[PDB]
Ligand binder design. Structure first.
Ligand SMILES: CC(=O)c1sc(CCOP(=O)(O)OP(=O)(O)O)c(C)[n+]1Cc1cnc(C)nc1N
Ligand SMILES: CC(=O)c1sc(CCOP(=O)(O)OP(=O)(O)O)c(C)[n+]1Cc1cnc(C)nc1N
Lengths: 785, 785
């Protein structure tokens, strides 16, 4: 114990020394000669206040892992860093562990490695100032605060004997996501999945002020964290005779309780332990400077000596601070290597914190077994039921690497068929009249969308599969956090040892065009714009036409890696236009369907399109309801005049690089063939008009393309009134097509008046009877298969 | 007591009867004859499960208001409905009291009014199914759950006699916004302000399953809500008499409130009480149907009898359910009015819940006094310091209707000058080394952005002013909720009795181009895209060029009403420009600056632009950090080649309707004069390129416009490296301009080679020295002063 404690103290001292050397020094890293003004970095970037807590937690975790390995237990520990601004200290904890030496050859544990890791911190072309995928064993960026407990819970599923210790700052704990994630222990069974160990760094200060949790006493914190499903233990630096002994006792007790919980079963609810660690912010640093308080104050957040390159007293303070660590007793200056204590302290390579096998995606990724797609049919299209049946088959075929997440909307979205295979995860009591609740359920349901997104991202980044479904309007709640994930993917594109990962799959349904029980608060198609905004080859939206297109698309997204895909489709009975082979060929051609109505010819290959024979007008649609309105308008236009030639175009997929998919994106020359250079193009969009305008900016002649979308209007009314309020009903589409072609009002005016009268009569019937007119409800639509 | 109890019971019986009549009946509202199949609505829309709790709370609130007015107390109570899907029951509570009759003449409290409110619920053209601005006394729609506590805390400020009772659902309490807002009592003093009263519905069930909070026992709930700084009380429907217990709870809660608000004896932290009530979901309704459980189960969420128009047993169940409420003992069928008992229950006029004076925007809105604008002094311009000084003057001049909100970032954003007027609100202990903390501070700081947005919207919707500042990267966290606010404004455009409101003002600074201490996670310019997507005349972005432009813009947004404005500017020492507080203010009438470099001529009136002489190319920028690069590129181009003519265009404001402001938006004819029809336009943007592409879709000839902006690339490096990574540096701009102008690549090949070599040398110097080259650091710019 005493030799053990001495080894932890030496490890902490060395980690602190390399942290300060990373922050300040650019030369004379070993301090063999007195410090001058030429051995200081020109710009003193970085942070210091949270580093000592990171060092203490990492060293105690290494000691605990060594003890567990001696006990011959199967538990493997991993570390998660919430405060991503404390990156350099963690870097030091890797350098003396030799994890970084397995990735970079220049980071060997010697004097050259010390110089390499000290000079290149925050340097242009060196290591970044924050956590990144370039760091081994890192899955959470920590830049945007929060999203730390949910990702830790998501990485623990289906990975027993894995203990993930995550560090959460007290200022970060004031966010909504962290506050909501405390209840995630009521839905996950730790015996068959694993244990998450939370440590709260209660330094007491934010960037420039005290914290909410730092103001609370010990009694209030105990009651708050025991009101949820946690068992908290508090250790404070201000009153402890020996801080490291208390930290060792707390970690040993927590891991003993974890081992006791794993070995055995209990027919009740579990209470995972957690550690609150209170310490002075920026401990073991400069105490005072220019009469102000640094240690134990919010002024230690950034660097505490901003003028060390020009002020003599600041340089003396920095030199004394670095010499307080006594690096001569740990390092060996003669040979340039560490002494014999570091080999005694560290365990073997297979059982170290930074090289956990359960967290790595290279040792856990497997292919997904796709069942045969059965394109069953009835009388009307029900895309959500078919998607649920296919996901039920997927759940049957892959019983270890597939999961489902939803914010209590599985029945409302017509995806309940998946309950024929698996139940919903629930660790609390079940009443006899309740159904679909089990401890080992593979569906997790909670109203906090942030927790669901964190669980999905943790499960995917560990190396497995998942799909998250939701309403379309409530998606942007997890908008910004999703963008963070995208950055990770971009930062994984330049790393040669990361490996492949499953795609991030969203199923957004119950769109605003058919919200019957709610009005104007459940219609917000802005999530797809945020998905399409990113430009690092990430972002795909799938726009099915019927149930066959829906099952083809949901089969396509499960075969894609390292991307983000969103599928938006309705859940109401709908007409059917395409069979299985036509839908599959359309998806393999990008997702564009072209039809000529004056000759009744479907075109699925862009070759053999006649230049001598071109359409007079183009009607294009994107989305199921707008496609129904477009085909109804095309039917009316074929009935009435039939002298002009109309080409019908439907788009099934959109990507950040243009029209179609990333693998097969429509080019600038095929757009000219599909869409004629000068003919008008009336376009109906499921979402905002500017979302399509941004994509169509880069294509040929954007002046003639009229685009109509949601336009942010509507209330609780009939579906036809909802379509007519935003000028995307069939009659206004026909009016626009008549006015866009030839003179318009000169010859086709009376038809415009007749169509407006028909729309007025339909709206009057809907207003008077609260149901749609029988002319629209019993409409006879077109067929293509 | 007993007379009051039976009057309350009669009120709740009437409320339940009108709620069911609103949900189901189309005719025979008084049930004079036996119910048939022709008196049922064709579509049964609405919700029922949460309505009885709303009715109980409203009746007890009215009783407690009458009892308060008996003793001549100044406290005025208001009601807030979190579960917005429970709208019809609240409507019933607005019918027996004559609040709805003051707005609508047809809603008079008689038989015709009963028919009017029952027939038109969820009808096309009638009352909506959810809460809306059309309802008097409503400031929160309740569509997106979780924004109820923070809005109440925002609306409760500077109103010492307003007590707001808000209803929160147990499923809604699982959202992170509510869990973050539970701690808001530690920053707002309830003696000089009002008291927010939270009530937890706790019916036990979500849409399709149990709730997390419903699974917790009483002991766990007591600990969780005591640890957060509240005084919870529990009443359950499984008791002898629910109404007597509820009345005792409300009476004791009001006694504590009056004993704490007017004595002022306590100087330490306070403990606001809250009410936790437990009841069966959909109480006093259908018990069983088709062998399933309805009352006390999640199946009572929507309509519990979905086939009452076709099934005889369902119709009989509905008739028995409605006849369970004996409406004959509360109504006179021949007179058509209520009996005398209601006149003994309702309090005096204007002492009623639905007509609170402290909540209405009318009778509380006052114009803001703008101090005189002053110019900036010095070579380098600091926009944030000038903005802070102007806000300090505003705080001085308006000591009762202005407040500031920030997520612990006002020191880092160079806005600390406002600390010369007011401190930060803080109700906890203050250390001797801590500064800018006071109980009566007018600045609220917490890391939860959702709480800040809720406080700002609550303050603004009651008829006062406020400004919220933040980083640009973490703004999208509050994107979607902001969209909800915009919808409110749109509905307020169609309500004739709703008064004016102050604009929603954002200041986002520390942009991604100058994140020195942070890396990739702190660059995300997507919030302005979310704001610009509103299409109801809402959404304005202000893009200052220097400090004078910043103060002119911040003076302009404080003079705008019923809108949303965003101001984005840097905080680094930047060169000054045309802005001398006079030319800048003249530019603000249009928001666009035009300069001709071949004759050194500024243009402020667009009708003076000569059509005979035209620029050879246009360099345009939007944002200060890239305006620097484009004026440097203009300087280099003027130095090297003089036979070409360059027109410099800067844009200061963008709106959803086009270029400029809503009051003065650039037309499609002025765009042709400013931007020539066929000349190339090299445009450089502060944010994403597609955000500007969507706006420029609607203008003339968008094919020739080369838009470059942030490309999601960068790391911890020098500012010039950050500019060059996204191809928006000065050398990139001049290379692009040379490529655009030149007919062939062999005329300016030496120049582009030289500029590429110069950029390579600058990047090499930055890589080797970690400091920008002296050629760039000591650059000499031009001025239009
Ligand atoms: C650099 C950065 O992004 C930091 S660090 C920091 C204070 C962290 O509080 P904490 O007490 O948990 O940290 P610690 O004392 O060092 O442990 C803030 C508010 N920010 C900016 C910020 C703002 N808001 C959000 C959601 N995320 C971030 N990162
Ligand atoms: C219709 C709608 O938008 C409702 S109602 C409702 C149940 C609310 O649970 P709670 O028990 O707290 O309310 P109560 O049953 O009425 O008492 C949900 C989940 N939703 C959809 C939904 C989903 N997610 C979010 C953030 N908001 C909403 N409104």
């Amino acid at each position: 114990s005493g030799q053990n404690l001495e080894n932890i103290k030496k490890f902490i001292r060395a980690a602190n020394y390399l942290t300060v050397s990373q922050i300040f020094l650019q030369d004379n890293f070993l301090l063999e000669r007195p410090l001058t003004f030429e051995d200081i970095k020109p710009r003193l970037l970085g942070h210091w206040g949270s580093c000592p807590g990171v060092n203490w937690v990492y060293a105690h975790l290494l000691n605990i892992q060594k003890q567990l390995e001696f006990a011959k237990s199967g538990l493997k520990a991993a570390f998660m860093l919430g405060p991503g601004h404390a990156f350099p200290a963690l870097q030091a904890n890797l350098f003396m562990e030799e994890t970084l030496s397995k990735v970079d050859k220049k980071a060997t544990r010697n004097a050259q490695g010390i110089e390499y890791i000290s000079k290149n911190f925050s340097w242009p072309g060196g290591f970044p100032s924050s956590a990144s995928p370039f760091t081994p064993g890192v899955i959470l960026e920590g830049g945007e605060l929060g999203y730390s407990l949910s990702t830790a819970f998501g990485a623990i599923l289906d990975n027993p004997n894995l203990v993930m210790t995550t560090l959460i700052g007290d200022g970060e704990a004031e966010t909504g996501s962290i506050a909501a994630a405390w209840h995630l222990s009521k839905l996950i069974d730790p015996v068959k999945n694993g244990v998450v160990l939370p440590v709260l760094h209660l330094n007491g200060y934010k960037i420039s002020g005290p914290t909410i949790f730092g103001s609370m006493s010990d009694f209030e914190l105990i009651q708050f964290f025991h009101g949820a499903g946690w068992e908290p233990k508090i250790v404070d630096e201000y009153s402890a005779e020996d801080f490291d002994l208390e930290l060792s006792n707390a970690f040993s007790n927590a891991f003993r309780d974890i081992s006791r919980i794993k070995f055995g079963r209990n027919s009740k609810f579990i209470r995972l332990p957690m550690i609150i660690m209170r310490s002075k912010k920026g401990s073991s640093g400069v105490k005072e400077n220019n009469g102000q308080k640094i240690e134990g104050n919010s002024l230690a957040h950034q660097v505490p000596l901003l003028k060390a390159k020009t002020d003599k007293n600041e340089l003396e303070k920095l030199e004394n601070w670095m010499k307080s660590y006594k690096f001569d007793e740990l390092f060996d200056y003669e040979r340039g290597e560490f002494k014999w204590w570091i080999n005694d302290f560290l365990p073997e390579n297979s059982s170290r914190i930074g090289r956990n096998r359960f967290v790595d995606a290279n040792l856990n990724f497997k292919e997904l077994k796709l069942p045969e797609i059965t394109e069953g049919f009835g009388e009307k299209s029900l895309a959500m039921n078919a998607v649920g049946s296919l996901l039920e088959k997927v759940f049957e075929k892959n019983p270890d690497n597939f999961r489902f997440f939803s914010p209590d909307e599985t029945y409302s979205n017509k995806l309940d068929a998946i309950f024929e295979a698996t139940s919903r995860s629930w660790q609390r009591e079940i009443k006899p009249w309740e159904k679909d609740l089990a401890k080992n359920g593979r569906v997790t349901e909670i109203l906090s969308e942030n927790c669901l997104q964190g669980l999905l991202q943790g499960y995917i980044l560990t190396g497995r599969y998942g799909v998250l479904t939701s309403y379309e309007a409530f998606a942007p709640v997890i908008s910004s956090m999703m963008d963070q994930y995208a950055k990770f993917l971009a930062q994984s594109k330049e790393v040669k040892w990361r490996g492949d990962l499953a795609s991030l799959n969203y199923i957004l349904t119950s769109t605003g065009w058919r919200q019957d029980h709610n009005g104007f608060n459940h219609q917000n198609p802005s999530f797809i714009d945020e998905v399409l905004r990113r430009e690092n080859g990430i972002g795909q939206i799938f726009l099915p036409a019927d149930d066959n297109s829906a099952v083809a698309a949901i089969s396509k997204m499960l075969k894609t890696r390292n991307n983000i895909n969103v599928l938006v489709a309705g859940k109401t009975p709908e007409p059917r236009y395409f069979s299985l082979e036509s839908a599959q060929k359309q998806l393999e051609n990008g997702g564009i369907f072209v039809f000529d109505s004056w000759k009744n010819q479907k075109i699925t290959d862009w070759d053999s399109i006649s230049e001598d024979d071109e359409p007079d007008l183009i009607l294009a649609a994107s989305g199921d309801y707008v496609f129904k309105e477009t085909v109804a308008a095309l039917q009316v236009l074929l009935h009435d005049v039939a002298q002009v030639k109309i080409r019908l175009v439907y788009i099934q997929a959109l990507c950040g690089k243009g029209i179609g998919t990333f693998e097969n994106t429509l080019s600038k020359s095929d757009f000219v063939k599909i869409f004629t250079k000068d003919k008008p193009v009336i376009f109906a969009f499921h979402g905002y008009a500017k979302t399509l305008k941004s994509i169509l900016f880069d294509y040929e002649n954007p002046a003639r393309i009229q685009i109509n979308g949601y336009e942010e209007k509507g209330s609780t009314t009939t579906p036809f009134d909802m379509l007519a309020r935003n000028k995307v009903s069939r009659y206004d589409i026909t009016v626009r097509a008549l006015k866009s072609v030839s003179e318009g009002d000169k010859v086709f005016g009376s038809l415009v008046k007749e169509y407006r009268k028909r729309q007025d009569d339909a709206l009057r019937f809907a207003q008077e009877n609260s149901v749609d007119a029988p002319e629209i409800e019993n409409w006879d639509y077109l067929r293509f298969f």
